[PDB]
């Protein structure tokens, strides 16, 4: 009898779907968590100056290891066992 | 309008949530909502919103 013109979720006229009591509680629970999130970030242990290059050898070593692993890309060795192992196809019981 | 804004017993207010970018709400809000504090929507002004 009463229709929502066009699509019911887009356009100038939409569905009057209201906010429920359960939805309000979900927002509050996330807000309480985020209120705690921005408190533990408030007071750093070290200042900006005291952390200047505190861990740079490890960063340099990590990048060097990345170069070393990526530079080892090369075709694998080829051995006689792989080629001579094909003759075992016609192995028989004499 | 100031006494009702000072004695409000609700910990969360539109000014606090929008400015601090809580819940990633800036994706939904407009940049003008930082100044409007949620009291203005389009050309409509609701004086009862704190």
């Amino acid at each position: 009898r009463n229709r929502i013109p066009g699509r019911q979720w887009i356009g100038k006229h939409r569905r009057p779907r209201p906010v429920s009591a359960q939805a309000k509680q979900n927002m509050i629970r996330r807000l309480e968590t985020e209120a705690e999130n921005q408190y533990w970030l408030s007071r750093p242990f070290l200042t900006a100056e005291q952390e200047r290059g505190h861990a740079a050898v490890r960063r340099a070593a990590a990048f060097q290891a990345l170069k070393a692993a990526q530079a080892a890309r090369f075709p694998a060795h080829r051995r006689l066992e792989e080629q001579l192992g094909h003759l075992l196809v016609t192995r028989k019981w004499s | 309008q100031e006494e009702r804004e000072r004695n409000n017993q609700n910990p969360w207010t539109f000014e606090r949530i929008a400015t601090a970018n809580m819940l990633g709400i800036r994706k939904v809000l407009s940049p003008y909502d930082l100044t409007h504090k949620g009291r203005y929507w389009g050309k409509f002004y609701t004086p009862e919103r704190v």
């Binding site: 906010v19 | 017993q9 609700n10 949530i17 709400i25 949620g38 050309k43």
Partner: peptide
């Protein structure tokens, strides 16, 4: 889509409606 300012109380995004309902004013009791 409609302009930023309209004449028909532009319907808010559903996430924004929850924001407008959780940031209400509670008078002291």
């Amino acid at each position: 889509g409609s302009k930023a300012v309209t004449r028909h109380r532009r319907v808010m995004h559903f996430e924004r409606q929850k924001l407008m309902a959780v940031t209400e004013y509670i008078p002291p009791k």
